[PDB]
């Protein structure tokens, strides 16, 4: 397997660059059982997760990563906590945490999908 922290870095790097460059492409990352939570309830699956992402109207979304923990978890998966600051559509940088369970896609090596995605602003 590749270092968890490496899967962690690369997914992280990859995710909110999508949030700034193409939210409309974020869905690709998610399975059928994948939950996405932005309390607010979970949408499930690629189709609704897209609908929710486009609803948040992510605009000029700069993102500051202040830490990343990423650990091997069951099924040769990786859990991930990101602590960070996120502004959107030109709002003030707000603090937040985001928890991800990334899980192996199965068919294809070194490929993961997001199985859980939990985001909560602290403010």
């Amino acid at each position: 397997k590749p270092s968890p922290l490496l899967v962690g870095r690369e997914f992280v790097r990859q995710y909110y660059t999508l949030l700034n460059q193409a939210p409309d492409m974020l869905h690709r990352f998610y399975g059928k059982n994948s939950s996405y939570v932005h309390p607010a309830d979970a949408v499930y699956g690629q189709k609704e997760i897209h609908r929710k992402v486009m609803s948040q109207n992510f605009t000029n979304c700069h993102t500051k990563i202040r830490h990343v923990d990423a650990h091997a978890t069951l099924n040769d998966g990786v859990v991930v906590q990101v602590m960070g600051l996120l502004s959107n559509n030109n709002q003030a940088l707000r603090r937040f945490m985001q928890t991800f369970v990334l899980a192996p896609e199965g068919s294809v090596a070194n490929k993961f999908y997001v199985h859980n995605d939990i985001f909560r602003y602290q403010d």
């Binding site: 690709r28 399975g31 070194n110 490929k111």
Partner: peptide, 9 residues
């Protein structure tokens, strides 16, 4: 091949 990648099953 050794590229870490992401996508749904």
């Amino acid at each position: 091949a050794l590229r870490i990648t992401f996508g749904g099953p």
